[PDB]
From Swiss-Prot, chain B:
Precursor of the fusion protein processed in the biosynthesis of the S protein and the formation of virus particle. Mediates fusion of the virion and cellular membranes by functioning as a class I viral fusion protein. Contains two viral fusion peptides that are unmasked after cleavage. The S2/S2' cleavage occurs during virus entry at the cell membrane by host TMPRSS2 or during endocytosis by host CSTL. The gene is S. Disulfide bonds join 12-34, 17-23. The chain holds residues 727 to 775 of 1273 of the full protein. It comes from Severe acute respiratory syndrome coronavirus 2 (2019-nCoV). This is Spike protein S2.
Length: 38, 49
């Protein structure tokens, strides 16, 4: 049997937030990641 | 006249280490040596915009 190897654990995590005196809400940006799998 | 460049982002972990547990444990005994691969390429990418 002939099987390819595709490596795992890739893609970045970027955070979008205002200051600590304004709000604690954080928007999370996935970097180059299709979110239908995760 | 050229204006902007190609903005890239390089992970310091996945280039040096092959996602092995031995390479990440030796990285924590180094302190941090890659503290400046992330912030310089961020600092280019702000100035490219």
């Amino acid at each position: 049997e002939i099987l390819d190897i595709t490596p795992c654990s890739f893609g970045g995590v970027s955070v979008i937030t205002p200051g600590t005196n304004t709000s604690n809400q954080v928007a999370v940006l996935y970097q180059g990641v299709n979110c239908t799998e995760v | 006249l050229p204006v902007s460049m190609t903005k890239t982002s390089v992970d310091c972990t996945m280039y040096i280490c092959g996602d092995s547990t031995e390479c990440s444990n030796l990285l924590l005994q180094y302190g941090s040596f890659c503290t400046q691969l992330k912030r310089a390429l961020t600092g280019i990418a702000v100035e490219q915009d």
